[PDB]
Design a protein around this ligand. Structure first.
Ligand SMILES: *[C@@H]1O[C@H](CO[C@H]2O[C@@H](C)[C@@H](O)[C@@H](O)[C@@H]2O)[C@@H](O[C@@H]2O[C@H](CO)[C@@H](O)[C@H](O)[C@H]2NC(C)=O)[C@H](O)[C@H]1NC(C)=O
Ligand SMILES: *[C@@H]1O[C@H](CO[C@H]2O[C@@H](C)[C@@H](O)[C@@H](O)[C@@H]2O)[C@@H](O[C@@H]2O[C@H](CO)[C@@H](O)[C@H](O)[C@H]2NC(C)=O)[C@H](O)[C@H]1NC(C)=O
Ligand SMILES: *[C@@H]1O[C@H](CO[C@H]2O[C@@H](C)[C@@H](O)[C@@H](O)[C@@H]2O)[C@@H](O[C@@H]2O[C@H](CO)[C@@H](O)[C@H](O)[C@H]2NC(C)=O)[C@H](O)[C@H]1NC(C)=O
Ligand SMILES: *[C@@H]1O[C@H](CO[C@H]2O[C@@H](C)[C@@H](O)[C@@H](O)[C@@H]2O)[C@@H](O[C@@H]2O[C@H](CO)[C@@H](O)[C@H](O)[C@H]2NC(C)=O)[C@H](O)[C@H]1NC(C)=O
Ligand SMILES: *[C@@H]1O[C@H](CO[C@H]2O[C@@H](C)[C@@H](O)[C@@H](O)[C@@H]2O)[C@@H](O)[C@H](O)[C@H]1NC(C)=O
Ligand SMILES: *[C@@H]1O[C@H](CO[C@H]2O[C@@H](C)[C@@H](O)[C@@H](O)[C@@H]2O)[C@@H](O)[C@H](O)[C@H]1NC(C)=O
Ligand SMILES: *[C@@H]1O[C@H](CO)[C@@H](O)[C@H](O)[C@H]1NC(C)=O
Ligand SMILES: *[C@@H]1O[C@H](CO)[C@@H](O)[C@H](O)[C@H]1NC(C)=O
Ligand SMILES: *[C@@H]1O[C@H](CO)[C@@H](O)[C@H](O)[C@H]1NC(C)=O
Ligand SMILES: *[C@@H]1O[C@H](CO)[C@@H](O)[C@H](O)[C@H]1NC(C)=O
Ligand SMILES: *[C@@H]1O[C@H](CO)[C@@H](O)[C@H](O)[C@H]1NC(C)=O
Ligand SMILES: *[C@@H]1O[C@H](CO)[C@@H](O)[C@H](O)[C@H]1NC(C)=O
Ligand SMILES: [Cl-]
Ligand SMILES: [Cl-]
Ligand SMILES: [Cl-]
Ligand SMILES: [Cl-]
Ligand SMILES: [Cl-]
Ligand SMILES: [Cl-]
Ligand SMILES: [Cl-]
Ligand SMILES: [Cl-]
Ligand code: NA
Lengths: 526, 526
């Protein structure tokens, strides 16, 4: 029986057998006051003693959020949907620790993605018992509020100041600072890791003065705050808060009255109107996201990055080979998970409209000009491939490269990976390739479990990735030093070296997407 | 009607329509006295005026040589067999010139491979009318003697001094020096290019003081003199000359009598006994090859290379992804062009015996240790792939890399390519991959001919390669400057950058086969 005394009370955990060993999991520990009633849309408030043995033996509620009902019954999409009840009372975190209890273990804190509109820490692909077992690190993960409830912003107004879900993540990081030594953890060796919006969140904790001392290093998988979906302008946020108000009959003349009104709405009426706060959306819409609130984020983060105002530490950054494909089946014409999606030039052009709402005509021709000079015009999957690359390069890959470039110019070691392995079990079709989100199960070690029907080459790839992530967290260097592995070079402006992750053998290459990102990065920002 | 006056007489050529343009081909011009009778096994003797209009309107005889009868009826092998009559009277060359006649065109001189035992300039994949048409270079190619008739060596004895076939190539290069201005060529801009044994020959003309002033630059495709098959020791040559003598009842006590006796044998009795001058051969045997004769080759060429004694100029060097596969079907157990050749560990070991005759047991275990640590032992094509890589890395790839490394250390620009495109028309099976010999048709431009059933991506690849080879020859720099192409970096010890050639897009990479060649290059030379 395992009871740990925390600053706020005792917690009981549960033992887990993993790979003939034991991990202790403390699932669903609370880290803030439930943000209900009068606390809705406010910054999370600190938690007071229970006393009391809190039983942390199951995952807690996930935060309220719309769910993906596009493919009912389909594992590829439904695997991302919440797997605990939804509730505004969702501010909990999970701790997994090796057994026997470590002495001063390095801590890995996971921040989930989901567009800032969705996600939960209890997903199966985020289960941190493999990492704790195999690498003897402690893994922590937290639920933070998403959608309007986590990011609604009425700028400067503490009733809805914005970034609440980023302040939830932050209060979780404090909880680790204050409490993790009790579980056997080293609060001085804490690495944040996150994917997509979770990565973008990691990148903003790098810029946030209040997070500076809550962690040591950072890992960004498929995301960074400079991605075009990751920060809402003050203009847009205002328009959106008011549009939500209007749609819920909460329009007022006094803004504090708007918020008061919205605090009376049911979680569901808020969720139902989120999608419409915007005249046209895309499959990549982030209606309620991070904003420059003067608190968490003191200035437009592009200025902070350019001028070197951020936590000085090592970063590990990466992307997958086919980032953009996943999104094309949520609204691009001619695209289906259920056929090979060979689309036409005219369809490609219609797709640009779906993904680039407006976007001058000249803007959209320019994408077309850049991506459709074939070599050569023979290949029927030409336009289908091009639309996926457009969406991935713009939304994920070039913004990750440009973040890494700018961060490293201030003197810190940065490591960049290009993940190019398609899981043998991917439920999505072949044409979608190495999709967004599908490195995650490799990082968390799921392929280490033989009972699971991954290939042997995949077990070995995962084992290597886990070692590299763990050495990065413990030592700031993502090497696998024992098995004559390719040495991972730092990424510098100038050479821009990166490491490819695949089952055959990993290469050092240079200047990923050079020609493409010159387009997105220099020209497109029409 | 096109008549050119040469130092030795007039020659008439013939007009050819190529790609809606015209090339003039002068096929089968003689360049030495026929080396018959008393001239057999001797250095080629210069040619005296005919006078006389020599009609150069068809390919000449190929030199005597054994033929590959392993796959009668099969295009994959028979495409390499001679396509003109065999005859000791085979010392002719071919010239292709653009029309209209150029003013001072760069010259490309092709030296064929065939293990020094076979080959001919009249093969269809060596037809230089596409190059002349498309790049307005002049292409020259020569037949030189092969087998015992070209390389028999009784060291120091001018009746059989060795390297005769290398002196045939050399006298052809002089002929270009003396005569090519008459066809519109610049004798000051001459590039040699060659594949396999033809490349090895190019690399020895780089070391040969008598070739120094007969050319400007060099291209080596899949071969270099330091390959383990490319130079015969004086010991071996002596043993082999005597074994041949013995086998033809030509043994004598006086060595000049041996040669005199052999000069009385019929071409055929010599050819028939070549294969046996050696106790055990391999599919890569070179029974009669270059030797250190004190004339063409003044010292063991490994010493010349190490100590920087060679023509100081630019080189272009490359290899194909699957060099070693072609050879495995000529005697490795379990291998067939007619099935997927999945062999077993025990078969793999038997293969090493075929390819490494002797070769201590420890020598052969060491190859096995280096090439059979799988990742992982699951894959059934494991051993089949490993044997091909063993044979390619040892015989072609590492010796080409080590040549390039050592040549470049003395201060010259060198460019290295890794050719990784499998021809859409390859007649050999899929498991054999990107085979030895199959870049050649791309270099000569055959895919530029649409009537020919190559894909569009292959036309474009070939067009690019032709431009790069031509710019190398004309300007010492293998760039394709017009179509936003990847820039080809020089190869330096230290970074060892190389360019990949494939239909999708070409990459700059580093340290090809690093771990493998450390084995062949440092350790194996057991
Ligand atoms: C700020 O909002 C308006 C959209 O007004 C919205 O009303 C909301 C309650 C919601 O239902 C939403 O769907 C609706 O559009 C944006 O201007 C809109 O542009 C289109 C173009 O025809 C009009 O049809 C909309 O009605 C029009 N607004 C109106 C009704 O006046 C505006 O773009 C947006 N500003 C942004 C994009 O930041
Ligand atoms: C691949 O499928 C897409 C997706 O739309 C279809 O899904 C299919 C599996 C099928 O059940 C079909 O009924 C369903 O609508 C096809 O795109 C569609 O093309 C059809 C053919 O006319 C149009 O009617 C639809 O407007 C269009 N769907 C939309 C709204 O995007 C696509 O044609 C198909 N392409 C192939 C097989 O290459
Ligand atoms: C030099 O040659 C001998 C081989 O003697 C050869 O006689 C030739 C005419 C030819 O027919 C050839 O096939 C025959 O071998 C090499 O030594 C040989 O090694 C084997 C081992 O058992 C014996 O069976 C051979 O007969 C033996 N030579 C003899 C007959 O005395 C020798 O290796 C070779 N030297 C090299 C390799 O350079
Ligand atoms: C692939 O074929 C090889 C090559 O040998 C065979 O060629 C086949 C296409 C067939 O016509 C066969 O008759 C011919 O001998 C096979 O290797 C052979 O394996 C057979 C099976 O017993 C042996 O009897 C032979 O000794 C051996 N051939 C030699 C001398 O190398 C091989 O087994 C086959 N493998 C497959 C299908 O994976
Ligand atoms: C635990 O170690 C503390 C220092 O941690 C450093 O060492 C590594 C863990 C590294 O990753 C860095 O994060 C840190 O700088 C030390 O001060 C504590 O006293 C230790 N606590 C124990 C053992 O109780
Ligand atoms: C032909 O050019 C001669 C010099 O050739 C140089 O220029 C390039 C062709 C280059 O590749 C180098 O090989 C040479 O250094 C010049 O001396 C001759 O006079 C020219 N002959 C003519 C035009 O009749
Ligand atoms: C809390 O849960 C544990 C584990 O299931 C159980 O053994 C324990 O009795 C519980 N305590 C109470 C009564 O909350
Ligand atoms: C807006 O209304 C709120 C309701 O409490 C009040 O506190 C605030 O002072 C008002 N301000 C004005 C005058 O707009
Ligand atoms: C190293 O390789 C061994 C087997 O040779 C494997 O079992 C082990 O898990 C590997 N270690 C890492 C961290 O990759
Ligand atoms: C040489 O061959 C040409 C081309 O076929 C022919 O026209 C010419 O008359 C020939 N001259 C002689 C008689 O050798
Ligand atoms: C070897 O025989 C040849 C035959 O002409 C002769 O020239 C040479 O002098 C002889 N040398 C001796 C004595 O071995
Ligand atoms: C350049 O590309 C064009 C078409 O854009 C092609 O027709 C031409 O042959 C190319 N030139 C070379 C040398 O590759
Ligand atoms: Cl899963
Ligand atoms: Cl158009
Ligand atoms: Cl094409
Ligand atoms: Cl790229
Ligand atoms: Cl052919
Ligand atoms: Cl064994
Ligand atoms: Cl395997
Ligand atoms: Cl390699
Ligand atoms: Na432009």
């Amino acid at each position: 029986d395992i009871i740990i005394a925390t600053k706020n009370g005792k917690v009981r955990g549960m033992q887990l057998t993993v790979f003939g060993g034991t991990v202790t999991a403390f699932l669903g520990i609370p880290y803030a006051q439930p943000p209900l009633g009068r606390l809705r849309f406010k910054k999370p408030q600190s938690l007071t003693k229970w006393t009391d043995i809190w039983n942390a033996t199951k995952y807690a509620n996930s935060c309220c959020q719309n769910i993906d009902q596009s493919f009912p019954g389909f594992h590829g999409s439904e695997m991302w949907n919440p797997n605990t009840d939804l509730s505004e009372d969702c501010l909990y975190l999970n701790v997994w620790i090796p057994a026997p209890k470590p002495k001063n273990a390095t801590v890995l804190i996971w921040i989930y993605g989901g567009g800032f509109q969705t996600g939960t820490s209890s997903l199966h692909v985020y289960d941190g018992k493999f990492l704790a077992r195999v690498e003897r690190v402690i893994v922590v993960s937290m639920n933070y509020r998403v959608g309007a409830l986590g990011f609604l912003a009425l700028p400067g107004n503490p009733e809805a100041p914005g970034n609440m879900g980023l302040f939830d993540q932050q209060l979780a990081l404090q909880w680790v600072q204050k409490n993790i030594a009790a579980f056997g953890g080293n609060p001085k060796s804490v690495t944040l890791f996150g994917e997509s919006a979770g990565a973008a969140s990691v990148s903003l904790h790098l810029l946030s003065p209040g997070s500076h001392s809550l962690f040591t290093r950072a890992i960004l998988q498929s995301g960074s705050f400079n991605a075009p979906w990751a920060v809402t302008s003050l203009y847009e946020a205002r328009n959106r808060t008011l549009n939500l108000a209007k749609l819920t009959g909460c329009s007022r003349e006094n803004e504090t009255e708007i918020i008061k009104c919205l605090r009376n709405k049911d979680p569901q009426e808020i969720l139902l109107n989120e999608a419409f706060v915007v005249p046209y959306g895309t499959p990549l819409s982030v209606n309620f996201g991070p904003t420059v609130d003067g608190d968490f984020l003191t200035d437009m983060p592009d200025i902070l990055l350019e001028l070197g105002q951020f936590k000085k530490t090592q970063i590990l950054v990466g992307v997958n080979k086919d980032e953009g494909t996943a999104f094309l089946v949520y609204g691009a014409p001619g695209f289906s998970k259920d056929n090979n999606s060979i689309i036409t030039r005219k369809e490609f052009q219609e797709g640009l409209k779906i993904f680039f709402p407006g976007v001058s005509e000249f803007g959209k021709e320019s994408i077309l000009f850049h991506y459709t000079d074939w070599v050569d015009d023979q290949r029927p999957e030409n336009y289908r491939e091009a639309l996926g690359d457009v969406v991935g390069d713009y939304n994920f890959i070039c913004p990750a490269l440009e973040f890494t470039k700018k961060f490293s110019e201030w003197g810190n070691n940065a490591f960049f990976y290009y993940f190019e392995h398609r899981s043998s079990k991917l439920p999505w079709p072949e044409w979608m390739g190495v999709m967004h989100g599908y490195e995650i199960e490799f990082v968390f070690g799921l392929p280490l479990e033989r009972r699971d029907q991954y290939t042997k080459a995949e077990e070995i790839l995962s084992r290597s990735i886990v070692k590299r992530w763990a050495n990065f967290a413990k030592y700031g260097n993502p090497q696998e030093t024992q098995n004559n592995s390719t040495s991972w070079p730092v990424f510098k402006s100038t050479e821009q070296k990166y490491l490819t992750l695949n089952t055959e053998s990993t290469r050092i290459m240079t200047k990923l997407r050079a020609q493409q990102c010159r387009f997105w990065t220099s020209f497109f920002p029409v």
